[PDB]
């Protein structure tokens, strides 16, 4: 059921507050930090943008918030309510799931409903020939793949394994990673494995077995949703691999607490890359001081109370600052359109009743409002945010920490306690060690990043 916040001009959201079901179940369990924090983030951004008279004077933004269940088909079926009128929705805050965002932009384009999506970093949405009405407040995953290849070069690792979830995040992020490895990336793919959308019979244990077959490929660079992270790390724990692999987490891993809660033994040293973030103090105070389960404006709030305390009726998530950035972007765009179509008329002027995606798309694209925490918010021609990233490591003694920053500069800090939890001085994956005495050809195979050492024995030295 939707939240259905009444307003003069009503927005929409595609927040995945519930996780994916199994064995044909329509929906799964609440994702807590991943979903609720984002949903409430918007429900705070809108509230504050309705309280502030400096933006949209006497105009209140509505919200038909609906769960996408992190499932693509259910997301489409729930998003159908936005365009049920062939009460109009002005803009849809797209879903974190990249495939969900892809399909919802494939459908909302037909009805000219603009989208500003937090997360959903898949590069396939960059094609304006198919997703012109789609836009992003986060950097694309192409820059993330390039940053990962750079980070791998800076760590001087080689012969990396990679694991990708089926869909448009994993397969289309790992493909860009493999391409930018071949493109003078100095790194060669050891083994690529695809986690299916519906893992069965403990598939993650055979994922771990496969990855251990290339035992030398100790660096596992991973493009999978947090459920797949949770299960692949639990499977690695079950195989007594703790301290063996070094994980490199894409932004699906980020600094989320669910991939690492009660699982710190294997996740230690897991270097991760996230878009540059600041902890938004206002939302933290609003959510902390909330006398929650007492004021019940939204629906799914009771499930959060029941699951966060295991009874019958913290740190904020990474993306929420992009959620509120997206909402603020929407609002600001609408404000500009108003000031360009009916200046001086406070309230909902008649021109804002038939709001159309075609005109609002330009104002969405060129909007600039310096963000909630001073990060500039702007969109290029394709509607993507500028590529800047923070580089994290999971260092114990929930204890993530900054170790560098990547924006075209590879600004790492190795002395910033960068050791991946074992040994000393950044232990390395490498396919074949150097052979100083000298080798008849140090013969490389067809993959150029690794060699067989045949020594200069005998008179051939």
């Amino acid at each position: 059921n939707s939240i259905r916040i009444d307003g003069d001009i009503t927005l929409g959201g595609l927040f995945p507050v519930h996780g994916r079901g199994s064995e044909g179940k329509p929906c799964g369990e609440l994702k807590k930090e991943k979903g609720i924090h984002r949903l409430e983030a918007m429900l705070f951004a809108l509230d504050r943008i309705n309280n502030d008279p400096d933006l949209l004077p006497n105009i209140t933004l509505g919200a038909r918030i609906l769960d996408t269940c992190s499932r693509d088909t259910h997301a489409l079926e729930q998003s159908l309510t936005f365009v049920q009128a062939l009460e109009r929705v002005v803009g849809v805050i797209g879903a974190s799931g990249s495939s969900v965002s892809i399909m919802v932009a494939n459908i909302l384009r037909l009805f000219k409903i603009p989208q500003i999506s937090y997360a959903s970093t898949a590069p396939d949405l960059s094609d304006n020939s198919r997703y012109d009405f789609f836009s992003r407040v986060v950097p694309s995953d192409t820059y993330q793949a390039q940053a990962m290849v750079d980070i791998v070069r800076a760590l001087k690792w080689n012969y990396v394994s990679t694991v990708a979830s089926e869909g448009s995040y994993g397969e289309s992020g790992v493909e860009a990673f493999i391409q930018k490895s071949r493109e003078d990336g100095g790194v060669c793919i050891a083994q690529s494995v695809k986690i299916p959308r519906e893992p069965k019979a403990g598939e993650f244990d055979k994922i771990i077995r496969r990855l251990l077959e290339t035992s030398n490929a100790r660096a596992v660079i991973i493009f999978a949703n947090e459920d797949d992270i949770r299960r692949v790390l639990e499977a690695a724990r079950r195989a007594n691999q703790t301290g063996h692999f070094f994980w490199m987490g894409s932004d699906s891993w980020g600094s989320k607490i669910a991939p690492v809660l009660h699982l710190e033994e294997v996740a230690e040293g897991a270097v991760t890359i996230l878009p540059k973030r600041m902890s938004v103090r206002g939302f933290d105070r609003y959510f902390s001081s909330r006398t929650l389960d007492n004021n019940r404006r939204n629906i799914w709030f009771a499930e959060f109370w029941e699951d966060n305390f295991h009874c019958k009726l913290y740190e904020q998530e990474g993306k929420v600052q992009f959620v509120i950035d997206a909402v603020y972007a929407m609002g600001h765009a609408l404000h500009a359109m108003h000031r360009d179509l009916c200046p001086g008329r406070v309230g909902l002027c008649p021109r804002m009743d038939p709001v159309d995606g075609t005109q609002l798309l330009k104002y969405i694209r060129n909007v600039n409002f310096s963000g909630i925490a001073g990060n500039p918010v702007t969109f290029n021609e394709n509607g993507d945010a500028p590529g800047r990233y923070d580089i994290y490591q999971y260092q114990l003694r929930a204890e993530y920490k900054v170790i560098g920053s990547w924006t075209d500069h590879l600004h790492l800090r190795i002395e910033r306690m960068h050791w991946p939890g074992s040994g000393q001085q950044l232990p390395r994956s490498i396919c074949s060690l150097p052979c100083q005495p000298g080798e008849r050809k140090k013969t490389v195979k067809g993959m150029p990043c690794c060699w067989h050492c045949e020594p200069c024995t005998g008179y051939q030295y």
């Binding site: 088909t73 489409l76 159908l80 494939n106 459908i107 198919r130």
Partner: protein
Amino acid sequence: KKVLTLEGDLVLGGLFPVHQKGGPAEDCGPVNEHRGIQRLEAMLFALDRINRDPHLLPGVRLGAHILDSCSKDTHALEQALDFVRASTAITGVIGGSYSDVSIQVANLLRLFQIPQISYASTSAKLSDKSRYDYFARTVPPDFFQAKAMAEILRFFNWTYVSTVASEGDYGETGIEAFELEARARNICVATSEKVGRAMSRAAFEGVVRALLQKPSARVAVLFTRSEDARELLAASQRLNASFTWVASDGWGALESVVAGSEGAAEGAITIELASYPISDFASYFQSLDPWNNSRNPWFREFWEQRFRCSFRQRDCAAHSLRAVPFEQESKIMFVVNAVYAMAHALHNMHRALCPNTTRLCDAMRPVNGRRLYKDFVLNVKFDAPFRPADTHNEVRFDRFGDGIGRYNIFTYLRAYRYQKVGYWAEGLTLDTSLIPWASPSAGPLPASRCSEPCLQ
């Protein structure tokens, strides 16, 4: 722009690639001769025969609402919105042709439980009934073509092979399934190139250079691109580089891709669905008169294209489809069967809850899609229309809305025409004596291995 709408009375919508995919502009291209107009006229002929049939829906006349997809999924969705704008109520949408268009339209239609019988959607991704619970299919999945293709590459000992795909479902799933099979049969995939949905002309020559980077892999297996009939038309390049192409369902028994480009020389191996030409449709199509055929809007543009005369001017109506030669498109059957299947489903429903009268009693007309598909369309079982007298072929559906796997293997041949080499039906059979490669007369049988065999 134009839409083909016949009379009412429970119309069946249809998606056909009547026009070619256009360039960078927001417009369609030329008229697709074989893969396009012929399938549309076949479904129209099937509807006419069904209406004429005294047994199939005697009291119900089947209309049509035919749309043009232009081989673009985006335009396909923008057009197929007319199907859901009814909630005249379209009973079901037949077709989708290219599997990405079919996937997009099925995703749109599952919100309105519109049954979709596709005549050419082959990609294995449409086999998942969790996402496509209202999808039926008269063709086998492409997984089986990855079987046949592997068998072929194992018969000529082609251990080294290069894969070319296109972005979208067909290419992705085809190369994934063939790579799985190749690893299952010790066959090594040298390289895996992909072409984007509308990638440039020069980048196709770049992809051919990448293919040539591995000189050992003389055999370059082709996964249809979007459709070899018009995308490999831009990638069968004759920059003095030759191969032994092995080609999927997008290449076979049509000259649209091989015209003017003999770089894909005689002997290129293609796989097409196993089918027979229906006899009466040849007469129907050849006898068809452009000024009498006021039904089809695109037919007049097709006859402006085939014969360069514009019907707005003279030098037209002098030629005819009887004088010029006619070859029936391979999938024409897979179209007509689909239409008949839907008709029979409707007839079964009329036998079920409307037996007391000739036509609909107005309670079924808001046709419930879910019961229709699950109980009637999925349970159709009848022999194919207009079979050759010998065969007993029938067009029942699988447990998950798919057909039976049977393929014919062709090779391009000079004195220039295609030629059926053999067939795959749960086992490969090649009568190699029928192709120039057996009894090697141009050097030995073409070889593709990573390294040469060595002595004791």
